[PDB]
Design a protein around this nucleic acid. Structure first.
Lengths: 137, 135, 135, 136, 135, 135, 135, 135
DNA sequence: AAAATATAATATTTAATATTATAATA
DNA sequence: TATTATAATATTAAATATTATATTTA
DNA sequence: AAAATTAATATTAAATATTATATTTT
DNA sequence: TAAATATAATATTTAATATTAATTTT
């Protein structure tokens, strides 16, 4: 439903944000890579958010680039990967690095990311090498 | 709940759009007929959207006309038709000739629509025999 | 969550509305009494809405006055009364007549309301006898 | 999803409010302490809200400070505590008073709060002893 | 699915029983009146059980007479009436006495039953009147 | 899970039965065609049952022939057909007659069945025209 | 629904059992204390089982004594205690020892049980000290 | 809950069975490897069943030997393998060949099984990588 | 190194049915 | 020139009982 | 004052096996 | 005017535990 938020940064409490959009402040969770690029509090920002709807909560996940949001959606669509595991994956390394690892089949880089083990790395490699990285994001 | 969005076209990635309504960009999925009518990116556009609410997602479906939204709601109220099938039906045919086809009991035209086979074709005909008027 | 909408009347298709609240058009269902007091299309309006959330839809119900919204909430809180039946009740009668009938324990007046029968009237009377005392 | 609302106080009937955020009036429930700090109707306000989503309702709970909102979230996160009980706790006591009660393991100060009994106070103490230790 | 159990009374722990139906001991909850008619532990006994199925429990409610089970089913099919309240009503009043009270609108007797207030008694009355038309 | 009950007919309350299978009495609902072929109470009888499981109830439906059970499962698997409509269809006419009617697209015979209208009859014909494929 | 099983011990691989009751082998999970008292395979045994029903599984938990089953039900009735934790508690300690620890508010004894942490220790103490009124 | 059924084979309609356990016939789905070992109709047979409980269905899956039932449980416990796929795998290859092929991480033999592709074969190989002990 | 413990923290749907290709085939 | 089975993809999803009120047929 | 019993009444919600990290031991 | 029969529209949580004011004996 919500695919982009364009407002002013109100509070900066990592990993979360408060993106003030004409009065309504949105609680948006961002990766550390996105955090490293945000301006100072009070400056305008534009995040490509992805809304995760549950039976007990609505959650927003903002990214500085559309490709990042697409990759996050494809990652959370996996059976064993959830929003926070995907966020850790995107924080540990870039999208280009992730696709290079997927097409190279190297679990050493993936296991280096906190929260990612050998089984998780194998599942990620399988489910992405199953024709998801044919075209670079 | 949401019946219309009046903002500016932020970006155009078919079949999806971002409609920047005062900062908040809404992801609306539109038929190809609607896409062939939208202005260039950065210009105002008004869409009559229908909000689909599930247990795990909130989806918006925009249309250039209100009658298209009404027809979409009628189509998705069917037990065998979902948002994707209704979108395919509305992209393949406009409202007028779709109504003509349903009133003419002509499954042939419905079959040519991608994603629409036969069984669903006569199911749609049966369920739309007496659902709407000549319009 | 949403307790009031303050925008401009965009489209008036009874019993539904579209309020262009800074671009976002909220589809609001209102009773006939509320419609009879609405301005023409394009003029500002203020509705005291009540949001009904289900597992497959979000619905908005607007009213001209806050007391009407409160009465609607208490009515739909009942085990046999839903948004449609409550809207019918508030269209047939205003707040004052409804409360006077509840205090007077009148049934024939409630039966005359379309969609309301003998059992519905009895259920309303028994469920509302204790209420409205505080006023 | 919603963590703050900066609008104009349109209506004020306790314990709820109506913040006119650019036309959309959000109905927000606030504790007594927050109500004793809001200006008169028609003046701008800023609440650090917490959106509670259930299977059949979306609810907003506003607070004048972010510390209050964080404490409310931690409280409702408890199994035996819901929004109403947390609001009663926060209305009866401030954040500092509740914190020092938790650290000192005081039940008399918690039972006086309406809606809070002996068993509820015991559960609150046992949970909040380990839920948070260092509070600024 | 289960409408009768014909076994031997293995345990008698009020208000619950254990019917050893060929090895499987079914745990059945019965009214006080039923307990007052059961034989001693180890003797054969037949109960007309009603199976209540929820998302997290399968419960059996046994009765000495079929009419008692029918009345329990009708009572629990109501809105605000449950197996606990229905069992309390059955223990407090016999089937004939309950029917007479329903016909005679004698709420005083119903209020005498523990766990029964005033509004719930009046409800029981009003729904039951047309739920059963004097058998 | 349960596809047959071989016990003794304990009670006969149409359209329901009680099969005393080694002590446990199963509540089984049967069509009129099956009802007419049952023996007297106390005599052994074998029913080919179909267990319907819901979020709040477990229901058994017994038939005198396996083909009847298969047809009932096929009918209730449909979109707008439930156990009640399927049982009405089974009671109204024989399995062979139902197959003949659906193969010949004879709606008039189906309309004569109580509780079966033109719209639902057309739905059944369209959904079962090719399902049987001559068994 | 099921409160006792009286059959024959068919298979015994800990911590689960197969209790052949007239052909139907019920797979029952038992604590180590019950395991140490079971007879050899093929001999009759009576277990006081507790049926746990979930949206996607039906589970049986058998015990050598009724009081053990009552304690298990009380333990799993807690908010933060599940069947696995309750079984670990009952295997690591007897009912008498567990109740004495609850009365004495002893956490050192409880933490010795594998899978039992401190926080769980004082939670169990707080809940059970008030749960046990008479015992 | 049900870990074994010991009755007489009443009806053999592959891939389904009706095992008459003291009157109650149980609908059991078994792999073809079980079909090639069952006795004639009317003869005693023991199956190590596994009960699959859904929101709207209770299902039984029988096997000739316990290790097959264990393997079926492990297979269906996966996040992308269901009872149908597990049954297809067990029918195509026996347990020992299946585990031998998993140890070798060979997909050529898994793809040959009807209903099994390459992606699913690789995923299930990763899932069943050598965690358990060799049979 | 090499494996063996607790413990905090995550993730949370298959089933069935149509539909459109694809390889081999009257 | 069409036919048939298989195979993968991508949807679509499940309610059910109860008042209340319409034409019709007497 | 001085302790106990009780009938409404407003809340509150039921979660279990799988990892991954840290610590510990041989 | 009294139903018959569809006919479609509509509404669809429980139970369990904790609190608290009123009453009764002490």
């Amino acid at each position: 439903m919500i695919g982009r938020l364009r407002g002013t940064l109100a509070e900066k409490q990592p990993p979360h944000l408060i993106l003030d959009v004409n009065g309504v402040g949105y609680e948006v969770e961002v990766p550390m890579t996105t955090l490293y690029r945000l301006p100072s509090v009070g400056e305008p920002v534009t995040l490509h958010t992805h809304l995760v709807v549950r039976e007990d909560a609505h959650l927003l996940y903002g990214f500085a680039e559309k490709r990042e949001r697409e990759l996050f959606r494809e990652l959370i669509r996996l059976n064993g990967v959830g929003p926070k595991l995907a966020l850790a994956l995107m924080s540990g390394l870039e999208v280009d690095e992730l696709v290079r690892c997927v097409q190279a089949q190297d679990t050493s880089t993936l296991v280096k990311i906190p929260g990612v083990g050998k089984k998780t790395a194998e599942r990620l490699l399988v489910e992405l090498k199953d024709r998801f990285k044919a075209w670079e994001n």
